[PDB]
């Protein structure tokens, strides 16, 4: 045959993969954490999103940090052989480096060390994506006018920047999950992947902006957080 | 609006 | 005039911008830290590098944590306005989220800060790029056979992934630099530059592996982390 | 090879 190029991850395995959606908008009363109001729409059009990408998508609801540890070393223990991919999409409370279970914390790094090339070998060179609507601190953005690394493959799409609070409106969703479900909606049968999520990154930037009685939480901007360890361009169609 |  | 789209970022004003080189060699004995051996491999690659991407390149050597801090607080206060961009490169020991000076550690927050939309104002919309070849932990990978957000338009491409050691070949330079520089001369003129980071990516997981007669620190691997707040895609090269 |  002729010249052949391998830039870009192979997707047209049998199955894209799994799209795994820890929803969690109802926490236990002993750990003082807000309801999560806008959350469920966050889901339903990552759902909708996903399966229209014809990713196999699993919705799960208010998860106690143990059912989510739970969950995740289960799905990694999966043959995900036939799957091109995995996507995992978190929404919760959250500090740096933490996502909220329904009755405490989780390390993310718990979370994803289950999919280490090393952990998880049907997903060894396979692209796995991390999307995280959570908050990463307290700051507020007050604007302006024959070996691979067991760390490969990752992708982390992040809602905010390192420190940062995430946005959420209790109607519309958050500011993040809006954006990248109408991304992908747009531009997943056109553009690469991180061209995707540098337009999330634009719409996030120049679209919304906090209104709020307190001035301490008014007139606040955001900025996503592409975190990137993908060694290939990802498209989320193939070439017949 | 909220923050997560 | 015909239909217009601005989903790049504007690289036609008269200059490219500045590319700040720092590269720390030799450190302050009472510091116990290591000379870098190779790194003016780097510092002379990455000159020669960027010189041919048009951009106007200081190299700085061996400065304090004190000087560190005076070189950006000086350069963020130049006028950047006939400038489409901005480029600094740290080269230096380090741990999370910290880069070293000679006689001691400096916040990378504290530098990035400098550059913030509203501290800038003359950077304010233009991508700002920080490469940083440092340590980010001891980790080490075995591996397997109306305004705009103050913190957007940044680009962080770090050498090595969160909490990981990152590797540097005393005679060839950094692993991460040598990429790099090989993937900037090869594509710069033809992808956009997080594809050409993605390449990055791919030649320093697959190309490198280290060498060590200490088992502890042989056979292991390494994985770059870019960390992108750009709102638009990147080109070094404009259509006349 | 070295660490930075």
């Not at chain 1, 739970?70 to 043959?79: P, Q």
């Not at chain 1, 691979?148 to 920047?161: G, H, K, R, W």
């Not at chain 1, 531009?187 to 930037?205: G, P, Q, S, W």
């Amino acid at each position: 045959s002729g010249i052949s190029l391998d830039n870009s991850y192979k997707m047209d395995y049998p199955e894209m993969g799994l799209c795994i959606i820890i929803n969690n908008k109802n926490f236990h009363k002993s750990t003082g954490m807000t309801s999560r109001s806008g959350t469920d729409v966050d889901a339903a059009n990552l759902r909708e999103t996903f399966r229209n990408l014809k990713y196999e998508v699993r919705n799960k609801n208010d998860l106690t940090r143990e059912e989510i540890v739970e969950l995740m070393r289960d799905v990694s223990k999966e043959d995900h052989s036939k799957r091109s991919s995995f996507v995992c999409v978190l929404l919760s409370h959250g500090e740096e480096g933490i996502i909220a279970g329904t009755n405490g914390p989780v390390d993310l790094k718990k979370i994803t060390n289950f999919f280490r090339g090393d952990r998880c070998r049907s997903l060894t060179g396979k692209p796995k994506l991390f999307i995280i609507q959570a908050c990463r601190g307290t700051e507020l953005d007050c604007g302006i006018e024959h070996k691979i690394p067991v760390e490969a493959d990752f992708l982390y799409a992040y809602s905010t920047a390192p420190g940062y609070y995430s946005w959420r409106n209790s109607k519309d969703g958050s500011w993040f999950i809006q954006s990248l479900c109408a991304m992908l909606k747009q531009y997943a049968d056109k553009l690469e992947f991180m061209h995707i999520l540098t337009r999330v990154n634009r719409k996030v930037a120049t679209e919304f902006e906090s209104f709020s009685f307190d001035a301490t939480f008014h007139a606040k901007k955001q900025i996503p957080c592409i975190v990137s360890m993908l060694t290939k361009e990802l498209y989320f169609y193939h070439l017949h | 609006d909220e923050v997560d």
